Each structure stands twice: as structure tokens, then as C-alpha cells.
Amino acid sequence: LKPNAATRDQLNIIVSYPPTKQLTYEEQDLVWKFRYYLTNQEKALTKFLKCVNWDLPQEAKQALELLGKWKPMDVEDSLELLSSHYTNPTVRRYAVARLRQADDEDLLMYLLQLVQALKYENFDDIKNGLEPINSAEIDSSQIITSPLPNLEQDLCTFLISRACKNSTLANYLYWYVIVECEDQDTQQRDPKTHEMYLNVMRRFSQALLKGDKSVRVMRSLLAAQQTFVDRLVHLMKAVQRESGNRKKKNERLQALLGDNEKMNLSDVELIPLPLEPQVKIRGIIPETATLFKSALMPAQLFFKTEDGGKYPVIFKHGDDLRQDQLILQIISLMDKLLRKENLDLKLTPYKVLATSTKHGFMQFIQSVPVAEVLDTEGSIQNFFRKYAPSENGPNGISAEVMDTYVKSCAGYCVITYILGVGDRHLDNLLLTKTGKLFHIDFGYILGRDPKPLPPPMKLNKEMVEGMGGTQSEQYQEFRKQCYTAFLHLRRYSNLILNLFSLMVDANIPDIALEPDKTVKKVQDKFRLDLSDEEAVHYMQSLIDESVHALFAA
Ligand SMILES: C[C@@H]1COCCN1C1=N[C@H]2N(CC[C@@H](C(F)(F)F)N2Cc2cncc(Cl)c2)C(=O)C1
């Protein structure tokens, strides 16, 4: 029953191993023996469930008795029980029971991954949920637009249940499920999975229709959004087909946008913007809409908002926004995590929402790429002097602007390092007149890069020069903020890792390459082998080596 002191210490070693580390057969044999003692340790549960062979009915049965008797697990820990690693129905109900304890604010932080977790759920239990054919004959983008006249819930039931009580959650659940239906690789390689997402959508549609006055209206709005996107897509196809230069294309873009009788995109009743449903839109301003220099022909569009505002967006048609959608979702979570630890590092986690595997939205943040900053003002400090001057301020620039700059440089240095962001150049490093420095274009992630031998630390001459060099007080503050952000993010390793673990079968280019090796790629950047004091030095070493190497050119 109770182990000795030396054994109690041996078990403690195991309980606090990283998630990618595999327990040995004898290691598990020990944990299995003292499973009743381990009951008082919530962090032991994870290690315990890794000892069970769910193909052995009595072992599974034995384990589930202990699950009900175990110390209730964390909401961050419950995300591990929804991964592909656990498919036993009761285990997955336990995970959901722990999510029933979370706020919608947190549920929203994990919803991208939760929608993905439906792939490991029971497809029949989801089908038998439909109250009273070829799957290709059922258009996903037509379900909501064609309305017909303790451990009780599974994941599907739960997500819909909460989506009816909350309009924001419903908007994302809808679009996250819409893109999972629209996935052509899933349709072709796993037809039974594609059928499931359709059944989740029909269940959601049905659930709304059975709801009250406010719930029933959510279904109309969702259908109004679908319809708007559908028409924006048709407008895009048209402009991309239009023969001529960018000038002739923009003429056609604004021409069609101006034609509300034909297109219905310039004047509409207030509908939640798919990208940020907290924002209601009146339609697109035609005259301000144009195409970017890019060969894809993406469009910058100005949405008239509920309160006279103008919300710029990038609408890409002919591209998959899911990888950028994941990266921006992680940067947002990491920013929220740092703020929770009272460390606001002036980050720019703009919104990205793929509305299909072929099209999506992006929240446009007014800025100038550092490339252009140099092409016109010659330096980051010259640019900041122009738009943000102060006589008493450091290097003849405002304190707030200088402070925001150092803070975001440090924030992004750590995040881009942890997420292993490749293809870094001055075209995708953006700067704001408030001092906000941020990265865009997440086409190369988790150590992937177009060029061979990419550096682990994405830092350059211009960035350091903008700080007033290596001997500045600012440079010292930069270092201090890097290693602080790092220790804070390392604290939330389990969560960042469990979420990435739920993206292995998501069809994210750079995750698909090595799904098995993905979690470890991230897990290694945290350097969980090192103590906080060691980590601080490891970070300072990265910075030194990086800076020395960049001046050596
Ligand atoms: C929404 C965010 C944040 O706000 C800023 C823009 N932005 C992005 N811009 C972007 N891009 C891919 C390349 C091109 C595009 F989309 F046209 F194909 N550019 C335009 C672009 C490129 N370089 C500088 C600027 Cl300001 C603008 C992004 O993945 C994100």
C-alpha cells in the first residue's frame, strides 16, 4: 500500500518527467504497484494513464475505478486525455468533465485543438445524436443556410452545449468545423472522419433551431456570415480572372463591390465579422478596397463597423491560412500567459481566420516593414525620431516608444525561437509608430527554413541598432526581458505542448512532415533539462552567440 522513503523519492522523479519522455516497462510496473498512494498527486495521473494497456479490458476497467478515486486533474492536464493517445470513452468523458469547470475565455484559448480532438471521438455516438446518401451530395457551406421546417457528455455534445449559451464561441466552433468539412485530404484519405464533421455541423445546426429566440437568431447570423463569405469568394475569383494589371484589377474589385444589387457586399444588416465576432459589420467600403503587390492577389478590405469604425482586413483567396492561424493562436495564448504573470510585452497577436482550406481573413495592423523603414528613413532610430520625437527621451526618441520597442523585440525573440520560425527577413518584420515590433508570414515554422543552416535565434543588426547598440541601458533591459519571458513561458510548457500534441493530424504543412517529432521540437526549445537559473544563462548565451555572429556577417 504505502511505499518506503527511497521509493517515494523514485516515484517523485517519474511523476515530474517531461510529456515526450516515455516510461520504461519496469518504470511503469512501479507506478502501477503504488497507484493507490499516487492518488493524492494530481500530476501523477498523467504518468499513471501512460501505464495502462486499453486493449486489456480488465486493466482498462481497473484504471477507470482509480480515475474516479484520483485527485481531480487540471484543465491544462485534461487536454492530454483528449489527444490521439487516449480513445477509451470513459477517459475522454473525464477530460470533458474537467473542461466543464473552465470559463469560456479559457475554452476559447483551446477551441482550435478541441475541434481537432473530435477526430479521436466516437463517430457513431455523434451520428446517433441526429434527431429525425453520398457525403459529396451534402455541401457543408449549406447546412446552416438550409434550415428544415458528472461524466454524461462527450466532446461533441459539450462544445455545442456551450456554443448555444455563448455567441463568440459558436462563431469559432462553426468556422473551425466548416474548414474541417472543407478539408479535401480528410475527405479523400478518411471519408468516415469527413462524415463525422458534417454530423457535428448538422448537430450544431439542429441544436440552434431547437433553442430560444436568441439561439435561433445565432443560426440566422451564422448563415448570413456563410453567405457573405460565399459572395466575397465569388468577387475574388472574378478579380483574379480579370485580365490586366493591378490597376485594372482594383477597378473591377471596387466596381463589383460598388454593385450592391448584384453583389450585396457594400450594404448589409449588422453581422458578426467571422475574424472577430465581437465586431459587427455594415459591409465593405468599395472605394478603399485594393489588391496587394503579391502574385496570389490578396485584397485589403475596409469593413464599416457598428459604431462608424473601419476594420481593415487581408482577404486571401487561393491559399491555406491554417498554419498562420495556428501560429497566431499560439502567439495570442503566449501573450495572455505572459500578461497573467503581469508581463505585458507589447505583442501584436493579430487575428487570422481561415474560412476554408482555400480562403481566409487576416486582421490588418497598420505598420511599415523594417525593410522600407531603412529604404526611406535609413534606420529604426531615424524612423522613431521622425514620428516619435522627445528631447529628454533616449536617443532623441520618446520613452514609451523606446520601451514598447525593447519589450516587443524581447517578446518576439523568445516566441520566434520557441516556435522555431524560419524564413526571417526585413519584408516580414514590421514596425509601428508606437514602437511595436512584430513578425508576420508563418510559412516556415518548427525549424523549417528555405535556406540551409538557419540560426536558432532570429536577430539582426537593424534591431540592435534601434536599441542604441549593445552598451545601451535599453540593450540591458532587452536581455532582462528575454530571459524573464523565457522563464514565464517554460512555466506553461505542459499547456503549449498538450495543445501542439492536439495538432498532429491537423494537416498543417510543417507539422505533417514529422507529426511524431513535432512536440519534442517545441519541448526542446524550453530546455526543461535546465533549472531556471541555468535557463537564464542558456538564454544569455543564445543572445551573445547570435549578436557576435551577426556583426561578424
Ligand atoms: C494581417 C497582417 C498584420 O498586419 C500587417 C499585414 N499582415 C500581413 N501582411 C502580409 N502577409 C503575407 C504577405 C503579404 C500578403 F498578405 F499580401 F500576401 N502581406 C502584406 C504586407 C507585407 N509587408 C508589410 C505590410 Cl504592412 C503588409 C501576412 O501573412 C500578414
Swiss-Prot record:
PI3K/PI4K catalytic domain segment(s): 285-551
Subunit structure: Component of the PI3K (PI3KC3/PI3K-III/class III phosphatidylinositol 3-kinase) complex the core of which is composed of the catalytic subunit PIK3C3, the regulatory subunit PIK3R4 and BECN1 associating with additional regulatory/auxiliary subunits to form alternative complex forms. Alternative complex forms containing a fourth regulatory subunit in a mutually exclusive manner are: the PI3K complex I (PI3KC3-C1) containing ATG14, and the PI3K complex II (PI3KC3-C2) containing UVRAG.
Gene Ontology BP terms: autophagosome assembly; autophagosome maturation; autophagy; cell division; cellular response to glucose starvation; early endosome to late endosome transport; endocytosis; endosome organization
Organism: Homo sapiens
EC number: 2.7.1.137
Keyword Cytoplasm belongs to the record: no
Cofactor(s) named in the record: Mn(2+)
Name of the featured protein: Phosphatidylinositol 3-kinase catalytic subunit type 3
Coiled coil: none
Cited function: Catalytic subunit of the PI3K complex that mediates formation of phosphatidylinositol 3-phosphate; different complex forms are believed to play a role in multiple membrane trafficking pathways: PI3KC3-C1 is involved in initiation of autophagosomes and PI3KC3-C2 in maturation of autophagosomes and endocytosis. As part of PI3KC3-C1, promotes endoplasmic reticulum membrane curvature formation prior to vesicle budding. Involved in regulation of degradative endocytic trafficking and required for the abscission step in cytokinesis, probably in the context of PI3KC3-C2.
Keyword Transcription: no
Catalytic activity, reaction form: a 1,2-diacyl-sn-glycero-3-phospho-(1D-myo-inositol) + ATP = a 1,2-diacyl-sn-glycero-3-phospho-(1D-myo-inositol-3-phosphate) + ADP + H(+)
Lineage, broadest ranks: Eukaryota, Metazoa, Chordata, Craniata, Vertebrata
Gene: PIK3C3
Swiss-Prot/TrEMBL keywords: ATP-binding, Autophagy, Cell cycle, Cell division, Cytoplasmic vesicle, Endosome, Kinase, Lipid metabolism, Manganese, Nucleotide-binding, Phosphoprotein, Transferase, Ubl conjugation
Domain PIK helical: 1-200
One GO CC term on file: phagophore assembly site
Post-translational modification (record): Ubiquitinated via 'Lys-29'- and 'Lys-48'-linked ubiquitination by UBE3C, promoting its degradation. Deubiquitination by ZRANB1/TRABID promotes its stabilization, leading to autophagosome maturation.
Tissue-by-tissue expression: Ubiquitously expressed, with a highest expression in skeletal muscle.
Residue ranges, annotated region (Catalytic loop): 420-428
Compartment annotation: Midbody; Late endosome; Cytoplasmic vesicle, Autophagosome
Family, as annotated: Belongs to the PI3/PI4-kinase family.
Broad enzyme group: transferase
Molecular-function GO term, any one: phosphatidylinositol kinase activity
Whole-protein residues included: 286 to 873 of 887
